[PDB]
Design a binder for this molecule. Structure first.
Ligand code: FE2
Ligand code: FE2
Length: 174
């Protein structure tokens, strides 16, 4: 009843999964069907969507650097995950994680969401900073519940059009 296997060396597990910690794939979840979702995230990867997590997110940047674009107190903000940094993100703080560096590796820990506890994914207008669009999801598996969400935002000018100025968000790349 060691459901998740025995202890294993983390530095070598990362090395052996280097090929998955780059595009297209970029991340890799360590254990399946656990309440703690433990993930190593590589790079490079940039993104425009902001995440509204209904629970906390723990970060430990083992290798290389990254940063988070944030909305805090109503203003845009960057928080830097220099190598060796740890960070706890409180629920519902909008965050957009940028990972410019190949060969980087960040341990990210989250919890399964209970039924009815929803995640949100939002884009904002580069022009007027207004909320451009938001999907809420019952997040079960990032691999099938998230890609289609981004794809459908990039494909629809109607979803990218700011409802306050009319600027059509550029979609995938800022
Ligand atoms: Fe997140
Ligand atoms: Fe706008």
């Amino acid at each position: 009843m060691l459901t998740y296997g025995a202890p294993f060396n983390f530095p070598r597990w990362i090395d052996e999964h280097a090929h998955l910690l780059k595009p297209p794939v970029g991340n890799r979840q360590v254990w399946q069907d656990s309440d703690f979702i433990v993930t190593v995230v590589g790079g490079p990867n940039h993104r425009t969507d902001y995440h509204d997590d209904p629970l906390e997110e723990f970060f430990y940047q083992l290798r290389g650097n990254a940063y988070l674009n944030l909305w805090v107190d109503g203003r845009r903000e960057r928080a830097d995950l220099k190598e060796g940094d740890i960070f706890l993100l409180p629920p519902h703080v909008r965050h957009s994680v940028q990972r410019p560096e190949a060969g980087s590796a960040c341990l990210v820990i989250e919890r399964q969401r209970p039924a009815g506890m929803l995640d949100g994914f939002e884009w904002y207008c580069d022009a007027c900073g207004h909320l451009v669009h938001r999907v809420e999801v019952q997040l079960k598996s990032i691999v099938t519940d998230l890609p289609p969400l981004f794809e459908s935002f990039y494909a629809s000018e109607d979803k990218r059009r700011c409802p306050h100025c009319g600027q059509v968000h550029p979609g995938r790349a800022a």
